Amino acid sequence: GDTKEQRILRYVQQNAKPGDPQSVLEAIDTYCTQKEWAMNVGDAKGQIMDAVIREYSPSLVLELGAYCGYSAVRMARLLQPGARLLTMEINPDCAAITQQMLNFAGLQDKVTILNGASQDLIPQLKKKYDVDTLDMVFLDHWKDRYLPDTLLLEKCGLLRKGTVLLADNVIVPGTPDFLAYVRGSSSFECTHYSSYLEYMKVVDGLEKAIYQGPS
């Protein structure tokens, strides 16, 4: 059977307008709605991401986690000429799909896709990919890695004063260590944008509990 990401890409290729990032994003949205698949990042979170990018005009963005490439298209389409997105993806098939999604969108020249784990690639950014400091980091990979990778980014000298970290899913499934750390630290000035997450077609459950009397 075809992967979830392959099917999304195929719908884009058959329905979106080539070279039109907005058309690509709408076709992903339309397909996920039709299939009743929950979106990793939809338009609600996407509008928050757009607003941050437009406010800070980052020239170099690091993205942790690519999925089918929706978020990469969402951010890359707003980058100025000369600006650059680096996307880390641990799954080689998602990395290939993201590359092909960006190609269809006409955004291939703005994005470099790195296949591997964040903690293996981050220490290579300076020498292997000629990075000085990052202007913005979008964290959307394994939730238990947000704080370690933030500390790793700091230890590697990849953060400058004014680097924007934008972290998805900090409430659900949640990154409570990351939040407590950056909010408590004087090294980070923190703003939280409330939104929503959707679940579709998941196992749930009920509990019956019969009180036995005080014990």
* Chain residues 15-34 in contact with a second copy, contact rule CB under 8 A: none
Catalytic position from the list 168, 177, 204, 207: 168
**Rounded CA separation 43/49 (Å):** 9
**Rounded CA separation 204/197 (Å):** 16
- Options 142, 169, 170, 197; binder of Na ion; rule CB under 5 A: 169
Task: Report the DSSP beta bridge partners of residue 87.
Answer: 63, 113
**Rounded CA separation 68/133 (Å):** 27
Per CB under 6 A, does 74 bind ligand O01? no
Catalytic position from the list 36, 198, 201, 204: 198
**Rounded CA separation 71/48 (Å):** 12
* Contacting range for ligand O01; rule: CB under 6 A; set: 47-55, 85-93, 96-104, 170-178: 85-93
Phi and psi, residue 73, nearest 5° = -65, -40
Q: How many residues at the interface with ligand O01, by CB under 6 A?
A: 16
**Rounded CA separation 126/10 (Å):** 36
Active site residue 144: no
Active site residue 35: no
Per CB under 8 A, does 124 bind a second copy? no
Task: Report the DSSP beta bridge partners of residue 88.
Answer: 64, 114
Binding mask 165-204 for ligand O01 (x = CB under 6 A): -------------------------------x------x-
Residues belonging to the active site: 140, 143, 168-169, 198
